[PDB]
Amino acid sequence: GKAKKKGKSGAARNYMTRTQAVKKLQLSLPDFRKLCIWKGIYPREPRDRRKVNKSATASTTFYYTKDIQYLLHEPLLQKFREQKALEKKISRALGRGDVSNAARLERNANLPEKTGKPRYTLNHIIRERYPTFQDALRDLDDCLSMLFLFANLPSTTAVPAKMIARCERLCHEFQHYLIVTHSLRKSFLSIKGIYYQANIQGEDILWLVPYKFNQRIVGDVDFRIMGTFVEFYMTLLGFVNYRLYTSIGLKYPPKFDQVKDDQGAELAAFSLEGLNDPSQLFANFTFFLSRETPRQPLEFILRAFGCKRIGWDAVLGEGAFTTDESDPRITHQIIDRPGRYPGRIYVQPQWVWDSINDEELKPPELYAPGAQLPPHLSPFVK
Amino acid sequence: NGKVKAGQLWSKNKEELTKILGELKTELSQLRIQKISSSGAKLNKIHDLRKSIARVLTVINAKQRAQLRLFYKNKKYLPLDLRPKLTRALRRRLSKEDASRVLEKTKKRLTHFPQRKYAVKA
């Protein structure tokens, strides 16, 4: 019938640029990028970008029109608008000098610095993004690497200290689940960090944890969108931890002792309670970790592979089985320094990783202090 | 055949009612096709099928509206078709309580000096 006009169909209708998407959603750029990261809207590339927009360049970002249409019905848009209006009310109250009204309006803002949680709730987004717990377990690699990396940073404006503490607490709860289920399988010491591989419900989960040192935040990364990733991943890991604890029939969240955490218990601040073979490799031994040894990976690995009596120095933290080094019940001692009590096996830390990787107890004479260590092989590469 | 009583339809629920509407429309179509080519009792059977379709649609609509009234029983705003009709002037009329509101002075006067019951001797 009537002749069609050029550019009214095809890739021009299919794709949308970032500027057009922002103007269509009537959002700001930080809110748009945050929503795209949270909802999984990924950049796309047309075959010919001039057919979509004549002013587009090689740095132009294209999205799907149907993806923006789906973003139009997200309930977090009204949350953004209500939070902006609430902030305007708080500014008005502070400018008029009503401090009580300002505090009362501020307590409804749900600030991450005072809650430890994300500002905007992503619970409905979690079910949309992960229809199945298997998909959640498959994205747990990225989630665990992300949260274990941000467990050890100083507080910033994007990611506050209470949010970092919640990251560390969720990671500790996941580690406690792995310990009580003996799901940890392999570990590796690389030049970048410590690789951990576990098996949860038939799914292999591999993640990387940095060595406990001062981590450098460089300007080459987008730290605020990394913090948005952190918020999404803690929202995922909370429900993952809840489902795993309910499946093993334990109460969630676990009882957490603030006094012990204050004294430095770390993993020892949690007490797990009930609701209402390589796993016993270190069951009969008693370990003593010296202060120059990596306490959190050593404790996690030993407790996951069956050790029940681990002590350490008093500066390593509260919750040790014993503190004095002269305890006669100690069987093995981990030292890494360049006066040996009798009836005790002194080995370097690499003995623990080698023993858990080969599922057998290594000869201690090859791991004697001051000796040349055997090479540390990768347990993942056959 | 083709005559479906409303008493049977009032006990069915949604999906089998939609199904039976499907077959009733179906043999409506094919008995129109045999109507244009022959004659007999099909000319009464098509009327029976049409009335059966009307009954099924009526029952489905009535059950849907009853469910919607049950859902909107305790809400402030109702759909306009579920709102009472009355007339336009009756809908724009003042409510009974707003019409019966009185001032505080009038309330005091009616409380302490109402219309009394009395009689006069002859």
Partner: protein, 52 residues
């Protein structure tokens, strides 16, 4: 802002006005149609005037 009404104006969505049983009424049984059946492999129907 887009509309976020507190109640739907119409409680029940309308059933589709033109379904297949209303589109197709009856085939044509004339000499032209009954020739076209074997001449052109074409079936002739009487349909609704609104259907495309």
């Amino acid at each position: 802002l887009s509309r976020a009404p507190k109640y739907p104006r119409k409680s029940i969505p309308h059933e589709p006005r033109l379904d297949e049983h209303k589109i197709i009424i009856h085939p044509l049984n004339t000499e032209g149609a009954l020739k076209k059946i074997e001449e052109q492999n074409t079936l002739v129907f009487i349909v609704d005037v609104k259907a495309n």
